[PDB]
Write an enzyme that holds these catalytic residues in place. Structure first.
Site, PDB file in Angstrom:
ATOM      1  N   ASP A  35      34.723  26.809  81.547  1.00  0.00           N
ATOM      2  CA  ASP A  35      35.938  26.891  80.489  1.00  0.00           C
ATOM      3  C   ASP A  35      35.550  27.437  79.183  1.00  0.00           C
ATOM      4  O   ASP A  35      35.099  26.738  78.590  1.00  0.00           O
ATOM      5  CB  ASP A  35      36.690  25.507  80.365  1.00  0.00           C
ATOM      6  CG  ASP A  35      38.116  25.879  79.613  1.00  0.00           C
ATOM      7  OD1 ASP A  35      38.223  26.930  79.296  1.00  0.00           O
ATOM      8  OD2 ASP A  35      38.369  24.766  79.286  1.00  0.00           O
ATOM      9  N   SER A 199      42.375  42.918  70.778  1.00  0.00           N
ATOM     10  CA  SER A 199      42.464  43.944  71.520  1.00  0.00           C
ATOM     11  C   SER A 199      43.061  45.180  70.674  1.00  0.00           C
ATOM     12  O   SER A 199      43.943  44.926  69.795  1.00  0.00           O
ATOM     13  CB  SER A 199      43.041  43.533  72.741  1.00  0.00           C
ATOM     14  OG  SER A 199      43.511  44.609  73.626  1.00  0.00           O
TER      15      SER A 199
END
EC number: 3.4.23.22
Length: 330
Positions: A35, A199
């Site tokens: 994770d 992004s």
């Protein structure tokens, strides 16, 4: 040193991925959920409340000659779906794919929430976010990656998740055979303890690319792709019959649909998520309403590039002094 381990979807939907981890001496092998959005290595154990164990493999510290109680240390963690676990702490030898750390904090669960009990395939979590998020008190502990780092050939790990197929986690090297083209690296902020990056935009299907900054985290521990409501609405508007359902808790779509791809930007590069990756199947057995793999992050408080996005790429988690993230097509 290096390590290399195969990671395998837990079910036919890729709801999560498990990776075998050796703990203790002699080795006890548990299948953990790696994770990159948390920083605790915790396991079902011989200390876990018996009614809360249902099919998991447990770590038994008393059977490990290298286990030592970390006296006074406790831990308690909550996750994004409201699940949680807590317990005490041992140090022991932990190996992943041939890479060994001695003195690793292994957090032994005394309590786990229902969601964990009900998932017999996940024996615990191995956190790979920054150690500043580790919950051990009163002495915060380091992640497996942080402990391994100095010994690694290169201070990196890579995530190469499969779509309905096994993949690979590598530590200490970049497998140049595992991706196509070049790797595009992008800046990371560690301010919130995550692999947080920005992004450069998105496209829906064959549509034009929208240049827009989307801050979010690279999170192997989250199943879906969570993005701003504007972006998510633009995606689902291209699917006939798709709608946001309050009763189901997200966007659903007719199971008869063919989903468009979704592209996200990494610098000047582009990662394409095929439409099929966005299908999470019937909302309930036999239903003709299917659950979407792109969902709104509104009310989470952060955008999350979870497995839906990451499995479309070869992803480098670069833990150099100035950390960065690399994405390549594959």
């Amino acid at each position: 040193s290096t390590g290399s381990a195969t990671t395998t979807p837990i079910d036919s939907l890729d709801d999560a991925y498990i990776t075998p981890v050796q703990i203790g001496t002699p080795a006890q092998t548990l299948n953990l959920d790696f994770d990159t959005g948390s920083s605790d290595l915790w396991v079902f154990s011989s200390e876990t409340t018996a009614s809360e164990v249902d099919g998991q493999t447990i770590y038994t510290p008393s059977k490990s000659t290298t286990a030592k109680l970390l006296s006074g240390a406790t831990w308690s963690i909550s996750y994004g779906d409201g699940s949680s676990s807590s317990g005490d702490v041992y140090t022991d030898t932990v190996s992943v794919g041939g890479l060994t750390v001695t003195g690793q904090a292994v957090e032994s669960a005394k309590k786990v929430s229902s969601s964990f009990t009900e998932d017999s395939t996940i024996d615990g979590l191995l956190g790979l976010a920054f150690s500043t998020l580790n919950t051990v008190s009163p002495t915060q502990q380091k992640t497996f990656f942080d402990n391994a780092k100095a010994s690694l050939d290169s201070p990196v790990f890579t995530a190469d998740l499969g779509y309905h197929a096994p993949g690979t986690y590598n530590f200490g090297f970049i497998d140049t055979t595992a991706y196509t083209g070049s790797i595009t690296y992008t800046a990371v902020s560690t301010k919130q303890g995550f692999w947080e990056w920005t992004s450069t935009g998105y496209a829906v299907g064959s549509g034009t690319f929208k240049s827009t900054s989307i801050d979010g985290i690279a999170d192997t521990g989250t199943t879906l792709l969570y993005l701003p409501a504007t972006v998510v609405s633009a995606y689902w508007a291209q699917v006939s019959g798709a709608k946001s359902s309050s009763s189901v808790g997200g966007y659903v779509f007719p199971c008869s649909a063919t989903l468009p791809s979704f592209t996200f930007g990494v610098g000047s590069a582009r990662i394409v998520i095929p439409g099929d990756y966005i299908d999470f199947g019937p909302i309930s057995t036999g239903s003709s309403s299917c659950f979407g793999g792109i969902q709104s992050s509104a009310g989470i408080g952060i955008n999350i590039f979870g497995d839906v996005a990451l499995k479309a790429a070869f992803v480098v988690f670069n833990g150099a002094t100035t950390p960065t993230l690399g994405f390549a097509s594959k």
